[PDB]
């Protein structure tokens, strides 16, 4: 009986996140199609994403439940088709600002996609089902990225005919998004805890660590273009992302098998992997050889994703499902006030306006300071 809302909800998930034109984005933008100087992309367009993401996070979390979860999944499906329709024909610097804002809805409505399964599926088939709707997404993005590089390299297909595939992909994700059964019970509308030492401490690291990761993942495609321009040499943006995401997926899976009490060896295993990111982030900025630049990204994504699993596992050990939304909803929101303040100072045209060349030397110093405060705190 649970196979009907997991076949469609998963089918919607896979096709939505199978976007071949995610890796070849900046090389697509700063090309012969929508020529935009790198100073117009790293300081005027990209920052708008986090501004809109933060604004449309509480209003979409609260709406997602005053209405069903499927309605917001359909609101995320339409915002997938607008964003990628303006990215096809929309040109300028002002239009791309709108595109980012719509992309704010695309990813700020992602809360309504995971949380949907809880309401319509029997409670006992939750942990097992959540894996199906999470493991499928990673398979989609990995399959999408491989397809991008395996075509641009052997098929000689221009970057423009990658967003067409992306638009066709999301356009068929939407067609399914109408068939999920309309849930008949919400969590809060239609149905203090932080005092615990472990929850506050573990959650704080989750907020800080993800805030720096969303920023890197944002401004870590200009750097590759900066070190080796797309118009002068071949770029393996797709292969790197596919291997990187796969590297992350395996790391998350491994943390779920090795049985070690993450209480006495948690903080040390947290700082040790935090200085792996800070030590793997400077490598991006101090090397001229492009190949080394990817190797830094392979380590960073896999290493960090091996920490979010530790944080996620420790946060949710005494919390019931109904509590998940209000503890991973205020972690996903607090982590954005951190990014927005960081993007208004380190990147945005209003603030220091630092270009990408000097920009990564800050994030490398960002993950490095999270270790100093989470390691020297253990004094006596």
């Amino acid at each position, epitope marked *: 009986s649970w196979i009907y809302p997991t076949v469609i909800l998963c089918l919607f998930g896979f096709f939505s996140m199978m976007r071949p034109s995610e890796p070849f984005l900046i090389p697509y933008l700063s090309g012969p199609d*929508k*020529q*935009l*100087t*790198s*100073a*117009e992309i790293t300081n005027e367009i990209f920052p708008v994403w986090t501004y809109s993401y933060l604004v449309l996070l509480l209003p979409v979390f609260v709406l997602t439940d005053y209405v069903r979860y499927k309605p917001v999944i359909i609101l995320q499906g339409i915002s997938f088709i607008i964003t990628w329709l303006l990215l096809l*024909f*929309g*040109q*300028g*610097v*002002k*239009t791309m600002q*709108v595109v980012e804002f719509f992309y704010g809805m695309v990813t700020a409505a992602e809360v309504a996609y995971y949380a949907y399964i809880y309401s319509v599926v029997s409670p006992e088939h939750y942990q097992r089902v959540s894996g199906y709707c999470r493991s499928v997404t990673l398979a989609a993005y990995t399959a999408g990225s491989v397809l991008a590089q395996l075509l641009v390299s052997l098929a000689q297909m221009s970057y423009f005919y990658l967003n067409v595939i992306s638009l066709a992909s999301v356009s068929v994700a939407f067609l399914f998004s109408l068939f999920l059964p309309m849930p008949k019970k919400s969590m809060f509308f239609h149905a203090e805890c932080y005092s615990s030492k472990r929850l506050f401490y573990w959650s704080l690291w989750w907020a800080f660590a993800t805030a720096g990761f969303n920023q890197v993942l944002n401004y870590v495609q200009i750097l590759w273009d900066y070190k080796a321009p797309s118009q002068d040499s071949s770029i393996y943006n797709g292969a790197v992302e596919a291997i990187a995401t796969f590297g992350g997926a395996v790391a998350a899976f491994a943390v779920g098998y090795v049985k070690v009490n993450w209480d006495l060896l948690g903080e040390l295993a947290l700082v040790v992997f935090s200085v792996v990111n800070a030590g793997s982030l400077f490598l991006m900025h101090y090397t001229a050889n492009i190949w080394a630049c990817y190797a830094g990204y392979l380590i960073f994504k896999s290493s960090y994703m091996l920490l979010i699993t530790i944080a996620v596992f420790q946060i949710a050990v005494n919390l019931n499902v109904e509590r998940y939304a209000l503890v991973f909803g205020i972690n996903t929101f607090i982590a954005l006030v951190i990014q927005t303040i960081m993007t208004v100072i380190v990147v945005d045209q209003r603030g220091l306006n630092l270009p990408v060349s000097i920009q990564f030397l800050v994030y490398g110093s960002y993950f490095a300071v999270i270790a100093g405060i989470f390691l020297m705190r253990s004094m006596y």
Partner: nanobody, 122 residues
Framework: VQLVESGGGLVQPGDSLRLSCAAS????????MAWFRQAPGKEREYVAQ????????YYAESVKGRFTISRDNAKNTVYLQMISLKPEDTAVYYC????????????????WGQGTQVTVSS
């Protein structure tokens, strides 16, 4: 916007020139002005760029170091200063103004100029 280009002429290599672009009619929205070049029997080539609100510039790799593009909003012209011409720089120069606002089209640059001829030979 009605861009009008002038300042071309014939000169030996190693001779500097300045080109202007008197955009006029709809200045209030011009968010860039990038010069373009088309050598005989060839295709348009990127040559320069200048934002209007600020002063960021981005020159083509081949022409960098000798081409400087400077804005003058008071009269709305855009000056491209070129130094050290070579016997393979011969071409015609075109302006390209980005008006502004949300648009759906084939190319970012909305309005273009007519064309000025630069001939470097002996």
């Amino acid at each position: 916007v009605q861009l009008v280009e002038s300042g071309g002429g014939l000169v030996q290599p190693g001779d500097s020139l300045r080109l202007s672009c008197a955009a006029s009619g709809r200045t209030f929205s011009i968010n860039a002005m990038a010069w373009f070049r088309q050598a005989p029997g060839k295709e348009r080539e990127y040559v320069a760029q200048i934002s209007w609100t600020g002063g960021n510039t981005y020159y083509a790799e081949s022409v960098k170091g000798r081409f400087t593009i400077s804005r003058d909003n008071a009269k709305n012209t855009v000056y491209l200063q070129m130094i050290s011409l070579k016997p393979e720089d011969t071409a015609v120069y075109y302006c390209a103004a980005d008006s502004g606002g949300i648009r759906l089209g084939a190319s970012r640059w909305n309005y273009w100029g007519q064309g000025t001829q630069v001939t470097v030979s002996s």
